[PDB]
Amino acid sequence: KVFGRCELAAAMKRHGLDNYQGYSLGNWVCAAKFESNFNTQATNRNTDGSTDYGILQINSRWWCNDGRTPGSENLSNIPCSALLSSDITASVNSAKKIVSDGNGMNAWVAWRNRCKGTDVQAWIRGCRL
Amino acid sequence: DVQFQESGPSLVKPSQTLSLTCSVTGDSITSDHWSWIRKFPGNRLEYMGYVSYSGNTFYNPSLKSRISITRDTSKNQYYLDLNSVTTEDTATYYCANWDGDYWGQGTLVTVSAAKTTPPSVYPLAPMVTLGCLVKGYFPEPVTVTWNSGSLSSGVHTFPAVLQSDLYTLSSSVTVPSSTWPSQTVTCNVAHPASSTKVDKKIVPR
Amino acid sequence: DIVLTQSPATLSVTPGNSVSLSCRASQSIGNNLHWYQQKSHESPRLLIKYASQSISGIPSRFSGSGSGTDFTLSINSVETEDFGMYFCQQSNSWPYTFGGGTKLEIKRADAAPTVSIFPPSSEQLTSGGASVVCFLNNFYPKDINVKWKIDGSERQNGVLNSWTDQDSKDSTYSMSSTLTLTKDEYERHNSYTCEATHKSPIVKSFNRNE
Ligand SMILES: [Cl-]
Ligand SMILES: [Cl-]
Ligand SMILES: [Cl-]
Ligand SMILES: [Cl-]
Ligand SMILES: [Cl-]
Ligand SMILES: [Cl-]
Ligand SMILES: [Cl-]
């Protein structure tokens, strides 16, 4: 599923990302735009042989199992395919774990390059929520 | 299968350092943050801290910079050090995952200057009710079983009471008159802190 | 730090009835609210994550709802094994914090105790001490009175009482009453009586000479 901007803003708010670890809703919407273009089925292969899955591009080395990532530790991690659902619940749960890992949203390089410190409220501006 | 298990001293003197180890085992382990939670005698729960999957530490600011968490990923172990303890630190310490799925059994830790004393175990002889009285031990806890857990039904082990730096509790078991004293009934008492195991047979008179 | 208020701290419920447990947060926490069940002699057991998400192995009667500052845990057809403590915990902001807990007491009919009295063991008397033990097993409700008599006379000094938690299966309480004496005091008297009262008593006694 490809979300509209205001549609995703509403679902991320319903899924408790607004002010999760202090990060306002617009950071999360901005992060999805530059990571996945609001597409829950986005996949991108890295040089290292890992893959990033879904609306927030969760990495297969650390957080999900895709069966082909060299050096992945925990084979019982949630299948990376479950992070591609029209329902964002599983992706939101992984993102909350990642953002609590010690680096905040700096874990998302696209957020850091394009969203951090900018007018992120613009990504929820015009939205009913 | 995922198991979290705590271990370490059940007794710490005031002003010394409380040290516990968590061992994470099983074949079902997932990439998660590793936490310490404690439960005060009055039922209050406090989230002490965690070490992230990446190895970054988080500490409850309430612990007033007395807390250290370290890990050893080669042993699937992690560690809590809590400095300068007071009786305010007497609590049941749990290791758990950040997801909350998997918590350890909990280890009671007493902060106290009093001496480790092993219990005296006394048989209470007169459907028949039998007992054993577990008296003069420190610190908590003791565990009582009857015929190595086989008698699980019909058992009531009461909370210990503190008098003069020593704990006392009793346990009762109810069995059919047919069962006893034809077949033996034994209270098994363990006090890990003193390395004591006592098996006491209940005999008529 | 976020304060979670669980009110009321105690709730009594009849099995088969529904119950709602309130958790209010001092600031908005989105859905970042988890529910725990804790029975004494056991680790907390996660019931619900993120306000409403099902946890595998948790019976269907457990559900959560709410968002922002107002959360509820619902139990549909409360069962006897649902006695214990219920904790909310927020994960929106470090430091993570827990509510004060809500204790669930299961209602049932009145029941009188099975009373049993035991004299000091030969072993203990040899050791120089004398404890007389009285068990009041499997009664309801909790607030039972125990009285001790020595040689037909009331004795209050040196008595210590201890209750179990509500039993998971029958929702009864049990309790020990322990009368501690010097050997000298024990040896000076013959009759020892344990009397259990709920607002007609149950009496048990022994004679040292017998
Ligand atoms: Cl857009
Ligand atoms: Cl959704
Ligand atoms: Cl604050
Ligand atoms: Cl059910
Ligand atoms: Cl004694
Ligand atoms: Cl109780
Ligand atoms: Cl006592």
UniProtKB/TrEMBL annotation, chain C:
Residues 113-207 form the Ig-like domain. Disulfide bonds join 134-194. It comes from the Eukaryota. This is MAb 44B1 light chain. It comes from Mus musculus. The lineage of its organism: Eukaryota, Metazoa, Chordata, Craniata, Vertebrata.
